[PDB]
Amino acid sequence: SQQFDPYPLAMQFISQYSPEDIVTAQIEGSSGALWRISPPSRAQMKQE
Amino acid sequence: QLRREQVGGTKASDFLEWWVIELQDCKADCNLLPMVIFSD
Amino acid sequence: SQQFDPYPLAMQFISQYSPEDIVTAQIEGSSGALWRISPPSRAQMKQELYNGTADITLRFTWNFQRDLAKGGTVEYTNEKHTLELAPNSTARRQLAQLLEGRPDQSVVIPHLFPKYIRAPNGPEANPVKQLQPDEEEDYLGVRIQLRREQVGGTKASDFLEWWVIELQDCKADCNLLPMVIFSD
């Protein structure tokens, strides 16, 4: 709320929601799986 | 970004690939992307 | 409509639907992903495909996801076409040969790809009974093939495999399979 306090529309929107009703999703960036693509489709990707 | 890892021969298929994405302006949690969502 | 104009049942069925209510799904044939199977399970596949006694099944399943914001309750409509393979028949032996690593071997499974499908408001995307009266001989055939790519040692696990399927009678769009579906 402090971060978005100057703005009126943002402030009313955030005020509308309870604190235990908003969640932060800490999606990992690097923790992915192997990229699986057939070599022909990857070559076509690069060429296109 | 794309990460490679040699295994082992064909050139491009010769080794493992995966993808790493990170936020544009990251200081210390570069390996993490927050996403705030409001659920009614 | 012109293509199916002589037939009465087909003509009434097509007339029933609006032109902006039927869609063609240009599912790609060759643009697949790597076939991932554990080496023991692939070896067991090949061995059971050669020296098997019980018939082995082979199923082709379609599944349509429709937008749920337009009303309607069921959100997925799916159905499968199951084809049996009797032991030592030509197709099963052909597949067992296919897994051997031949460079340009191919197999043809007759009557597997139902071209015209219907997607009702229920979870049964049955193939149109009418446009394909035979219901088993009107299904298109599918040419299956396996592609290898050397990497690099164990022989069979030494290199990448994926599968490419294409329509039985293809002239220029061989890398594409159309699938016309009527949605109520």
Swiss-Prot record, chain C:
Expressed in bladder, colon, kidney and skin. Also expressed in bone marrow, liver, lung, spleen and erythrocytes (at protein level). Expressed in myoblasts (at protein level). Expressed in red blood cells. Expressed in cochlear inner and outer hair cells (IHCs and OHCs) and vestibular organ HCs. Signal peptide: none annotated. Disulfide bonds join C170-C174. It is found in: Endoplasmic reticulum membrane; Endoplasmic reticulum-Golgi intermediate compartment membrane; Cell membrane; Cell projection, Lamellipodium membrane. Disruption phenotype: Embryo lethality at midgestation with defects in vascular remodeling. Conditional knockout mice in inner ear hair cells show no auditory and vestibular defects. It comes from the Eukaryota. Residues 1-184 are extracellular. Homotrimer; the homotrimer forms a propeller-shaped Piezo channel with a cation-ion conducting pore. Heterotrimeric interaction may occur between PIEZO1 and PIEZO2. Interacts with PKD2. Interacts with STOMl3. Interacts with TMC1, TMC2, PCDG15 and CIB2; the interaction may be part of the MET complex. Interacts with MDFIC (via C-terminus); the interaction prolongs Piezo channel inactivation. Interacts with MDFI (via C-terminus); the interaction prolongs Piezo channel inactivation. Pore-forming subunit of the mechanosensitive non-specific cation Piezo channel required for rapidly adapting mechanically activated (MA) currents and has a key role in sensing touch and tactile pain. Piezo channels are homotrimeric three-blade propeller-shaped structures that utilize a cap-motion and plug-and-latch mechanism to gate their ion-conducting pathways. Generates currents characterized by a linear current-voltage relationship that are sensitive to ruthenium red and gadolinium. Conductance to monovalent alkali ions is highest for K(+), intermediate for Na(+) and lowest for Li(+). Belongs to the PIEZO (TC 1.A.75) family. Piezo comes from the Greek 'piesi' meaning pressure. This is Piezo-type mechanosensitive ion channel component 1. The chain holds residues 2260 to 2451 of 2547 of the full protein.
